[PDB]
Amino acid sequence: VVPFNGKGTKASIKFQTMVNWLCENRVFTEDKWKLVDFNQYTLLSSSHSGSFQIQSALKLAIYKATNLVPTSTFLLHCIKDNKIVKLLLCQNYDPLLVGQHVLKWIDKKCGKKNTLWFYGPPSTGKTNLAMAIAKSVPVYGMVNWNNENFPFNDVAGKSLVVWDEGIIKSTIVEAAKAILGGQPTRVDQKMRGSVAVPGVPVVITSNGDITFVVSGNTTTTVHAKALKERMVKLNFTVRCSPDMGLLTEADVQQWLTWCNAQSWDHYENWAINYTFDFPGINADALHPDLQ
Amino acid sequence: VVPFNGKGTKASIKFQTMVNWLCENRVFTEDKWKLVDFNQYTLLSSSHSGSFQIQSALKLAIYKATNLVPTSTFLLHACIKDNKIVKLLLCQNYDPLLVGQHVLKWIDKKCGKKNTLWFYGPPSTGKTNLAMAIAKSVPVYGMVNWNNENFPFNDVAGKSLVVWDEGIIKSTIVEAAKAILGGQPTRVDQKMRGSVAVPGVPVVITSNGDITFVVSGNTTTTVHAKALKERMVKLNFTVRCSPDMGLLTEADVQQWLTWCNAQSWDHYENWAINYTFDFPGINADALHPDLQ
Amino acid sequence: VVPFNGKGTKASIKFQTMVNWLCENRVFTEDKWKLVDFNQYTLLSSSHSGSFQIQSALKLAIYKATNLVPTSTFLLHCIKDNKIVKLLLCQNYDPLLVGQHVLKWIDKKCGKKNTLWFYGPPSTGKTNLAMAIAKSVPVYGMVNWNNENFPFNDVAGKSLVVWDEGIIKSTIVEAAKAILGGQPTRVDQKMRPGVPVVITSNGDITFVVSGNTTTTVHAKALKERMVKLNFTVRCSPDMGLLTEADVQQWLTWCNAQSWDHYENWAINYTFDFPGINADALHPDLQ
Amino acid sequence: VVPFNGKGTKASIKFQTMVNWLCENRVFTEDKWKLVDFNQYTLLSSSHSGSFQIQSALKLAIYKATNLVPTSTFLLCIKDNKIVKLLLCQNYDPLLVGQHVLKWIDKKCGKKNTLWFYGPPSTGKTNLAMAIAKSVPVYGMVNWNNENFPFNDVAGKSLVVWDEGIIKSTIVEAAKAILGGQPTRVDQKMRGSVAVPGVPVVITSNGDITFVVSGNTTTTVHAKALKERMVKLNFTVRCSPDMGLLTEADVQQWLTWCNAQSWDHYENWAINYTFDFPGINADALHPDLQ
Ligand SMILES: Nc1ncnc2c1ncn2[C@@H]1O[C@H](COP(=O)(O)OP(=O)(O)NP(=O)(O)O)[C@@H](O)[C@H]1O
Ligand SMILES: Nc1ncnc2c1ncn2[C@@H]1O[C@H](COP(=O)(O)OP(=O)(O)NP(=O)(O)O)[C@@H](O)[C@H]1O
Ligand SMILES: Nc1ncnc2c1ncn2[C@@H]1O[C@H](COP(=O)(O)OP(=O)(O)NP(=O)(O)O)[C@@H](O)[C@H]1O
Ligand SMILES: Nc1ncnc2c1ncn2[C@@H]1O[C@H](COP(=O)(O)OP(=O)(O)NP(=O)(O)O)[C@@H](O)[C@H]1O
Ligand SMILES: [Mg+2]
Ligand SMILES: [Mg+2]
Ligand SMILES: [Mg+2]
């Protein structure tokens, strides 16, 4: 599979440099391009043949950031002052295992446990944490934005699907089962080449148990066992301070930078047998920096 | 036929070379091209002219791979005891020599009316694994489960293989089923392509139960049972398999078919004179010492 | 009329030569072009100006081969050795007369009798002979490929229309009276010649289904437009496909024979085709 | 099974007598009742109860005539009969055919429930079929029903007549069951059993009905299936310009004579019902017709 020779001219080389510059500065939308580099956009729009190049370059940049680059590389660049590390300790979970699992999860390497689920009372910061992760990936999507009868459209081309205040109904149980489990949709099967893999990670925030499928005017539990195998459940029980504020990329990347530097032995021991719930803080193995 | 005495420019020769290169590297989709070679794709998509060239090259490469070059040449290659497929066939009591030799004719549409292979048996006996192994070797194939429920046979043309997994035939589409399973092209095929006859696509079917019985409402009917038997060939996978045989690979398929091509064809010509709905099993003495 | 004074460039003359090449080699479809000369097709498909010429040349070649050139010349290139000659002798039909009629029938010189009809028991070789002619003419079209309720789409541009094992429904009988009679469709008249039609069937086609009952209202009108041939004797399985050459040698030989015999019967075109006259059998056919 | 111990009043006995009278004179339609006896109809129509009694009597008479009595009862020197002359011209045994007609109308032929007449036009195909249809109490015609629903209101008839018929691929499935004598699903859901009504069918056509019309072409998939359920007759000989409309009297005389003769020659053919009806055997032809 040696690459074709194809010696290109300067016009194509400049376009390729622009495509690389798009990925390097995370410019994936027309609005972001206008907000960042207005002069180049104005110059490119002086002609139809120059306007076609914008639409040509954006698609290639998005595809490169989605499939040709590991997503975790966009995340990885004191520790005891990081808000997420402080926040996760307030919920009585080990920050190191959570951070280590997320990096393994975002690269679709957890196996069939593709979907994370955040559950707890309101005003515990579940939604705030989910937004920070979604803000850091190249492109993210929502189930809230999609149409009510077709909430699982526009899945392809996204690195993370966020479902806020979610709930599952019986009319969409067959679609949710495939997407939450990482199984590719038939669109990818009939567009790409047979059972592929891309799929997409999913993060869910909820104020109630989502394993209860809503059918008619009755709550049912036919699929409770089937759903649980696909998620890792976190209980956000402790209310957070009202003035914590929103989380940003610098907070998440700093937190994720520390986690990657530690040994994988602690995570890989539990990773052998995946459990529906996530283990809590173990004082016999807490990292010395967090003691 | 004397070819038209035209001569192309530098760009035309480059485009023809690119079409050949696409054929040689088994690239037939946009995603495959982006995965294999991103640089050439970017260079081609840098301008409006190249965006049309990409589509033309892909459309020509698919046609060249499917209609101009025999499919079996993509299977053969350019420790026979240890081949996984040979062991799997022996576990299910079938001769690896006859199975491989029949494929080299069925995949080439040379078997006449019997255009389909049928896999039957209990679950977890290895029906799906072998079926997908053949598919991964041919250039492009289509599986029925992708299509719409009411329209099962879309995009059948232009494919080297049709895959139907654990499917069941309904009476509402039994009329179209006898067409593809029989190897005769659909009505639209002749019209768009002028000739009353254009060969069909080979089909492979896996099933846990007898599909010769057609679903008709909430009732099973056997009126079409006779018609399916001369269009099909049956194999029985009656032995379960331990979880010690992972997914099969194209390397196993190529090695298996390579050996079957080199051996003599007398053992196949005897059966090929009058095809039988049942595929004969292992013969104790006919097994060659290379597999004894 | 004096042609225009326009002088073309190198590219235009090359395109005109390409059209002549396509017309000469009977390359009227994209699939045939790919199967015959893949190199030229790949060269042309490199850009827009090359791809447009493919469609333009195909359309011009079809028009030239259908309207500006007599179709019979496309068919003309041991007479007893030909398979078709024996086949017509078995059915008690004179090979010379039927051969001459086909040339006039394909050339629209038989007046209103624009339709041929093969009648007989099943498996008597009717479709084998009929399909042989369809592969000899430049372009042919079958009724069976068309939509069930629109059987007569894309009739213009075909050198021959074939209707195999067909039956006439009273809901569409009025359209059949036109095409089988050779009258041009009203759409052809608005935008701007008939197309020969051949019908093979097992029963009597003059009966028209009307509901769940047969009726004979249209039996009289359909008789004038058609010629009936009887294929009664079953064919041996070893005959196989009839080659386009077998038609070519048969038609070419019948062309050179004396034509005055056919003109005598041509004075009053009967619905029934006359059988073999033993006093008129050609010596070479014996 | 013992009849109920109840007793009917004087008025109910009159209605019971009226029901028997309707069956006795083959009065199954309102027009027939008006034509035959106007005084009684006018007297009955004087009020609500009399009008309702008309409907009740008609329904009960139809049921009694079609379900509780064998049809052959309504059908019950011979050289002068015109029907005998007709079959002799068509080269068929007058005695053998009549016995089959008696068994067929009584649903005693098993699967082969349908007759078929074939031949060139103007040879007596339709005339004979209508004469038999007139003799039985009630008959139905396929041509009267709607095109998309050719088999509506099949039950309740002693015979169903199909003239110049042709089978469309859309309705080929419904044709298989009814022509084969299989009961309709509608009656099974209503009556409760799995096989009850039973309807003989007679078909006359000028073309081969084994072929099924599908789209704009002919198919032979269903050819063998229909052959099992049908019997074929060839009317290949011409017929005089007059051959006056055959009457019920002509039919009744012919079948009565056939039933009187010995039945032994029939059941030999009934061992295995052949698709094609055997022709005249000049050796076995009855001496009266020799
Ligand atoms: N403007 C803000 N943006 C983000 N987080 C904020 C903001 N103001 C306060 N917060 C913090 O976020 C907490 C609640 O934010 P939110 O993300 O809605 O939490 P939650 O528990 O997921 N909410 P709920 O949707 O009610 O279940 C507050 O208690 C603060 O600690
Ligand atoms: N990717 C894989 N993961 C796990 N097991 C595999 C994989 N590929 C092959 N196998 C095993 O290889 C064997 C092939 O079985 P398979 O062909 O799937 O059987 P089957 O009867 O057609 N299956 P089913 O789809 O349940 O009807 C089984 O033992 C599988 O467990
Ligand atoms: N595909 C074929 N290959 C070889 N021989 C063929 C083929 N099709 C037909 N024949 C031969 O051609 C002769 C008659 O062919 P066929 O087209 O079936 O005739 P026909 O009278 O038009 N049939 P039918 O369609 O039943 O009316 C016989 O000798 C056949 O053996
Ligand atoms: N009104 C009539 N009643 C009785 N017989 C008639 C009548 N008119 C003509 N006939 C003659 O009766 C014979 C049969 O009549 P008919 O029932 O029309 O024949 P058929 O063979 O069933 N006709 P077709 O339906 O065209 O196949 C023929 O000799 C007719 O000439
Ligand atoms: Mg929330
Ligand atoms: Mg045919
Ligand atoms: Mg009649």
Residue numbers in the entry:
A (entry chain D): 202 to 278, 286 to 499
B (entry chain E): 202 to 279, 286 to 499
C (entry chain F): 202 to 278, 286 to 400, 406 to 499
D (entry chain G): 202 to 277, 286 to 499
Quote the passages of the study that discuss this structure, keeping the authors' original sentences.
The main replication protein NS1 plays a critical role in cell cycle arrest, transactivation of viral and host genes, and replication and package of B19V genome. Based on its similarity to other parvoviral replication proteins, such as Rep72 of the adeno-associated virus (AAV), NS1 is predicted to contain one nuclease domain (Nuc, aa 1–176), one oligomerization domain (OD, aa 201–270), one SF3 helicase domain (SF3 HD, aa 271–501), and one zinc-binding domain (ZnD, aa 571–671). The SF3 HD domain of NS1 belongs to the SF3 helicase superfamily, which unwinds DNA with 3′→5′ polarity. Totally, four cryo-electron microscopy (cryo-EM) structures were determined, which revealed the detailed mechanisms for ATP binding and hydrolysis and DNA binding and unwinding by NS1.
